[PDB]
Amino acid sequence: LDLIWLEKTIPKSTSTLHTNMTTLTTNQKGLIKLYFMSFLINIILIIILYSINL
Amino acid sequence: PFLDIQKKLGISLDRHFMFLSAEQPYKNAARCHAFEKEWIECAHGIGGTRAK
Amino acid sequence: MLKIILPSLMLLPLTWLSSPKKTWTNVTSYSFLISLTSLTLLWQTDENYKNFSNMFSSDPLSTPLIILTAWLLPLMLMASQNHLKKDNNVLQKLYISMLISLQILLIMTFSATELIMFYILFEATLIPTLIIITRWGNQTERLNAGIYFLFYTLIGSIPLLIALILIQNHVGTLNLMILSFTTHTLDASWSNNLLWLACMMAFLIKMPLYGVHLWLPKAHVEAPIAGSMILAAILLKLGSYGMIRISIILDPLTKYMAYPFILLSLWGMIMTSSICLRQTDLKSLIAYSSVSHMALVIASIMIQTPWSFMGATMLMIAHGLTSSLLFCLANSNYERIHSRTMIMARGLQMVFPLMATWWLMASLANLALPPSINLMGELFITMSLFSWSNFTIILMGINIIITGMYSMYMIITTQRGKLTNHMINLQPSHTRELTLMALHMIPLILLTTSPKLITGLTM
Amino acid sequence: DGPEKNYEKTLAILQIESEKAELRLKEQEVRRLMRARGDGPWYQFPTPEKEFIDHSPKATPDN
Amino acid sequence: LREHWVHILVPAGFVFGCYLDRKDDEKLTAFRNKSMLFQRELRPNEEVTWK
Amino acid sequence: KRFFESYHEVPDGTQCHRKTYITTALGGICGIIGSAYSVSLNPADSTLEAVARVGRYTFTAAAIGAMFGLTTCVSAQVREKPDDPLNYFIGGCAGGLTLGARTHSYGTAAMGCVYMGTAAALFKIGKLEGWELFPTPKV
Amino acid sequence: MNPITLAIIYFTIFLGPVITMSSTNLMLMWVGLEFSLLAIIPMLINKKNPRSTEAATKYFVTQATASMIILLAIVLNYKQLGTWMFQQQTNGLILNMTLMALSMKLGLAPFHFWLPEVTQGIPLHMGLILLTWQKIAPLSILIQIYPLLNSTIILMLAITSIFMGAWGGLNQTQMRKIMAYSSIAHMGWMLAILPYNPSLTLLNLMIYIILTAPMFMALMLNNSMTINSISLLWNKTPAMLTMISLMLLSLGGLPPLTGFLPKWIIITELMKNNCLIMATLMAMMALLNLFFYTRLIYSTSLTMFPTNNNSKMMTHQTKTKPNLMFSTLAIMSTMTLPLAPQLI
Amino acid sequence: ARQWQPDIEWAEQFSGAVMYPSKETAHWKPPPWNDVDILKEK
Amino acid sequence: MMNGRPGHEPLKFLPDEARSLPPPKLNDPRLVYMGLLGYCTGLMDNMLRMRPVMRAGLHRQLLFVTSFVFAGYFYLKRQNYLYAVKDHDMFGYIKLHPEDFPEKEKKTYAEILEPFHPVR
Amino acid sequence: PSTFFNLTMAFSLSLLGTLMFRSHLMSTLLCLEGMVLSLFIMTSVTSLNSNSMSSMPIPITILVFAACEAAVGLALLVKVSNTYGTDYVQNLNLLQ
Amino acid sequence: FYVREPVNAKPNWLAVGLSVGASVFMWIYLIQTHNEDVLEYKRRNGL
Amino acid sequence: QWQEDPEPEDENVYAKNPDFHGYDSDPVVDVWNMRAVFFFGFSIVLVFGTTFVAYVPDYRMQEWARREAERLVKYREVNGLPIMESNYFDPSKIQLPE
Amino acid sequence: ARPEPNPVIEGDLKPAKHGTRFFFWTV
């Protein structure tokens, strides 16, 4: 319960959770086309966020 | 605006031409000139929240 | 209270301006006197809390600590004159100043009227501590330990920041005096049930609770002796002081929102006490001893009966002094032995006759021998806990039996048995080592003569 | 100096803190009111200036 | 002082500390004799109950 | 939009059908958006491969949506408690589990259960306590 | 650069934000934005290294399309109100465009991809200007129009930025990009309070400028674009190790230092306005930013990384000094907190 | 003995264009110190 | 916020109305802080430039301690005004719109039944 | 009237273009310009039917700034097919 | 001493006099401003 | 392997300075860093402090209350009043609800 | 018709009440 279960749950898990996020969020081609379309997606969603909450 | 260097300096390089009812060349009034006046002499001294 | 503080600040100029050879004595001699000025706050002929000025106050709960915070700076600077005597003359003056700022900040935190003044100063103490642990930490793992000490406290801290700004909007001032004389009764909603957790959780984290205490074993292990003394004696008690002043508000919810922690602490007290029973690193065992004896405190600052509170105030001041004494003597063995292992270094009394007497008295303070404030403290928390539910004696009864076993085992396998054959020969005891101890226990003997001063706000 | 000094000092500290507290709360209510009501000097957002409206007689008649 | 001036630094802090301390008292002087518990008429030749 | 809102209008634990449908849609919508960002950046190799990923993300998200909706609604009826935040937690608990499965990982199910459920529970509390999100400036 | 050209460009890079701020006719605000775009591109390619041309060509396309979108908003307004400037009546979509566009020039949230990459290919110096004297212009336009913008979007871009900035930063090891990521994050806080109390945006900016400007002139004193490079700071110049430590922890919100005030008052203002949902999540991941700040702390100060023998050679030679600005902006930044009430 | 100062290996991790290297990200290599790529004869 | 107030000086630092307010005492703790803040800037500079920390630039040390302080008096003089305007503005509104800020009268405890949650 | 919705959608169709590169930097720099024409046409159109002559300066200021803007854009383009022998965007992936 | 003699061999007598002299102008303006200020404040209000 | 120093041994400070007190290596600083620490530590803190703390008078009023009780118990018993009446705030003052 | 100008706060400035009322700043 000390060491592994109480270190794997609270202290270590939170360590693992975010690292995955950065890895997935920071693994970017670096190509402009990809990045830009993401700008396209954003414009679309924000257009909607306004639309549906008109 | 954010930094009113214009009012302070008294210069008016950017205000004289912001609405249709402003001085038109050769005193040729623009269209709608009958209302914008009526809609901005109304909202003068009354802030926007109450110009709305 | 600006004599306990301004003269303190001036210590920093003295550590820097003073000669490299004379820097140590100017600083230690002067803060001994700084402690003497601190003793003036104890003059409370009447009940009224002494509100020195708008921002600075001292009531029975803070006064017993401000004096301890001022007292340990001398001692901390005397226990770290050995290690840190191999430095470049500008690393020392940094360490000395770091120690000085801790009590400047800690003196103010314990002597602060506005709860957010507590928060800003509360969470500032991490900066000086993290530097002491990470910069001078001997082991490869202090970078890790520092991270654990910063994040566990920080993630708890931002919820308290939101909560205190929240009550300021709800009530209109975070002044502990007013908040007390004003009607702040939470309404047992689901949200309030969260507010309560927000305010208590940050305090519960630095007061190691069974669930979040892994930071303290890791931190004290690689921390230098001065950092380990500060963490055990003053740093952990910052969490207790906070729980006493913050639960003045959130009065109704803790009646039923405490069960989770109370049970976490009492079962935690048993398991933390027990793992002390087989832990090879001595500093490790003292740290878990600190978790268990602090798990008793969170179980008295939550039952909230007059006796609990001053049981808590008695134990916190007492255990603070005892723990340091244990951490200080652990270091003296570590410096000659060069290893934290408990199994090595057996038989020391045969070679260090007196340090062993200090070891024996420290252990008897660690376990509850009766003419000691340590026992009075536990006896009282035990009583109230019994009042909360007669069954509590079983769990607070397995802890007493275990606490006796590990406290004596530290004496039996470190200071008795046949001498280790030939570790690097163990040079005799310095007079500094022995005084650093005497300075810890002579006050423990004197306070036990008149326990009234450290009894808390309740009594 | 005495019990008198701290009792009277603590009451003075409470009056300053009580009065500061009442005012801080009233600010939040006044600031809620002027934002929505726009009837007070704060939160008076701007509209064009009539100092530019041209009231001259335009050659173009009827306007 | 042969570089012993350093000594005064800390002591001096105490003096300024007590001075600044008095300043606060001077500031928090309302209720000097209005504290119900201690409201008394000034005895002869006393212009301040507590200073 | 009058649609999604409906989820809230009828008391919780009642009309699970509509709840599950609505919850499934939201998840699916998020699936599409999520896949889109996942395809726009970190593109695929072939159009089909990416169409698949859209599908994968959409379904997984739709699933987490469904089980959340179903579990929370049912947990309510069975427990005969419509405003007990726990309901949602059980639901979020389940939702995470679906995510875990679709990712074929027990561990994810762990974090998923706790984190996801907690979040959903907070949504219930939020609605119960009238917490305001993205509030208009009222200073 | 023929010193004349240097003057013309620098004047434009400086007339660019200033026209924006001073004018009220939006058009004149747009060309202020346009001049900044034209002036910055020459400096960006000064080394003319292959990385640089990439940087400028991205910065330019991202900046140009956003500039065109801002103009479209002004053109549309002109039809919905004869005025050349946003008013209470403005169609909501008209304002939202301006938010997205201006949030691209400032590089906030889902449009945060260009900044980290241009911050990576430009010199440390032009990095500062690209991060701090080019944010003043767009923010001015937003701060002026705050009464009218949407509280929902801003918050979403705010929260997103905080997250993206934080998460991005954790992985990065190149300093230029760690700063680019921090700027995205701080920029997020700034835009969170804009709808509620613009005056605080101007504090959360200045403090960011008074924090980042010393931090970058520190990175370049030794011109280290790597943490490994900044880690050998202890050998190259030991004194800056102390303040580099505090400024970076100040950039994150830790309480004794000046950096807490912007986060503290933004949280106080958001709770005053009841966003205790949004504010809480922001503060929490704000704590992620300090983790990567402290990881750098570890490498540069709290632990001494191994150095190279050839470094002894650089010690011998007198180190060209850091300008005075470093000090005045390091102290006013690391410790002004005792003077917060006046600042706000 | 003496506070453990970081060895070469502790230092190594901080090299590489990304701290926490991904599946494909690790394949990348640190940017050239001169900021000028060797590129090609072109 | 406070901008848009009647009479606002469009680009002025501290309108003369701020004359009415008391001047900041030169030894105001804050200005004294700014002084120390300054001395430190000076000392820090010496350090970063590798000069004897305290015994060098004794002219600069003065420029610093005296630049920061100079700045203070004239800044604090203003910030003080800004805060003072805030009350003038705030208090006035409380009156001009009295009904909205009505002086309530609380009841004495003898009448107020406050709930008692027994600790037991 | 509708005339305006065609021009506005022209700008959005040009928007969709600049935001979706197709391996030709020149083409993009050419799409970008399609917007400026649409903005110039719309600004001129409304100014003309509002008889707002005080504003005609703008329709042209828009073009003058847009021309230089494009000049800068093309010099970057020439700089790129001097370093990579092509304007193709894929080449622009060093900053990853 | 120094092979490559230090550029800062001696003070910049100018840098002293504009640094010292500037500061003494600051004070004499600052202290003047305060007493002058006090006065106006005192008289502006009743006293 | 990189260049780095060979482990520094810890000196037997007790080999030279056989009167080492544990504070510093050179002897005079040693003596003057214990002659001032035992003194300021023990001689005028544990002694003068305990003297002052012992003489704090009637700390927290508990010396006053053992007399006030005695007069109250003297007064209440002789006048026949209950020694500790069962309601403190008088019932008359309280305005109960209906 | 025209609307009524917002009323005018009147009087003279007096040092702010109790000083900057920021968190714990006696000021």
JSON list of C-alpha atoms in Angstrom, two decimals, chain D residues 8-38:
[
{"chain": "D", "resi": 8, "resn": "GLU", "atom": "CA", "xyz": [-8.66, 49.71, 23.00]},
{"chain": "D", "resi": 9, "resn": "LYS", "atom": "CA", "xyz": [-6.11, 49.01, 20.23]},
{"chain": "D", "resi": 10, "resn": "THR", "atom": "CA", "xyz": [-7.98, 45.83, 19.21]},
{"chain": "D", "resi": 11, "resn": "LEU", "atom": "CA", "xyz": [-11.29, 47.71, 19.03]},
{"chain": "D", "resi": 12, "resn": "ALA", "atom": "CA", "xyz": [-9.64, 50.36, 16.83]},
{"chain": "D", "resi": 13, "resn": "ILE", "atom": "CA", "xyz": [-8.24, 47.58, 14.54]},
{"chain": "D", "resi": 14, "resn": "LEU", "atom": "CA", "xyz": [-11.75, 46.02, 14.30]},
{"chain": "D", "resi": 15, "resn": "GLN", "atom": "CA", "xyz": [-13.43, 49.34, 13.42]},
{"chain": "D", "resi": 16, "resn": "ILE", "atom": "CA", "xyz": [-10.96, 49.95, 10.55]},
{"chain": "D", "resi": 17, "resn": "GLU", "atom": "CA", "xyz": [-11.39, 46.35, 9.35]},
{"chain": "D", "resi": 18, "resn": "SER", "atom": "CA", "xyz": [-15.22, 46.41, 9.77]},
{"chain": "D", "resi": 19, "resn": "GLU", "atom": "CA", "xyz": [-15.53, 49.72, 7.87]},
{"chain": "D", "resi": 20, "resn": "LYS", "atom": "CA", "xyz": [-13.13, 48.52, 5.12]},
{"chain": "D", "resi": 21, "resn": "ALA", "atom": "CA", "xyz": [-15.23, 45.34, 4.79]},
{"chain": "D", "resi": 22, "resn": "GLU", "atom": "CA", "xyz": [-18.58, 47.14, 4.45]},
{"chain": "D", "resi": 23, "resn": "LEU", "atom": "CA", "xyz": [-17.14, 49.46, 1.78]},
{"chain": "D", "resi": 24, "resn": "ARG", "atom": "CA", "xyz": [-15.54, 46.61, -0.21]},
{"chain": "D", "resi": 25, "resn": "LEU", "atom": "CA", "xyz": [-18.94, 44.85, -0.44]},
{"chain": "D", "resi": 26, "resn": "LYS", "atom": "CA", "xyz": [-20.79, 48.09, -1.34]},
{"chain": "D", "resi": 27, "resn": "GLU", "atom": "CA", "xyz": [-18.25, 48.62, -4.16]},
{"chain": "D", "resi": 28, "resn": "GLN", "atom": "CA", "xyz": [-19.26, 45.24, -5.63]},
{"chain": "D", "resi": 29, "resn": "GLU", "atom": "CA", "xyz": [-22.93, 46.22, -5.54]},
{"chain": "D", "resi": 30, "resn": "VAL", "atom": "CA", "xyz": [-22.37, 49.70, -6.96]},
{"chain": "D", "resi": 31, "resn": "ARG", "atom": "CA", "xyz": [-20.18, 48.21, -9.67]},
{"chain": "D", "resi": 32, "resn": "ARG", "atom": "CA", "xyz": [-22.91, 45.68, -10.50]},
{"chain": "D", "resi": 33, "resn": "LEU", "atom": "CA", "xyz": [-25.46, 48.51, -10.76]},
{"chain": "D", "resi": 34, "resn": "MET", "atom": "CA", "xyz": [-23.48, 50.98, -12.90]},
{"chain": "D", "resi": 35, "resn": "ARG", "atom": "CA", "xyz": [-22.39, 48.27, -15.38]},
{"chain": "D", "resi": 36, "resn": "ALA", "atom": "CA", "xyz": [-25.99, 47.25, -16.17]},
{"chain": "D", "resi": 37, "resn": "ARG", "atom": "CA", "xyz": [-27.63, 50.62, -15.50]},
{"chain": "D", "resi": 38, "resn": "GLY", "atom": "CA", "xyz": [-24.91, 52.69, -17.20]}
]
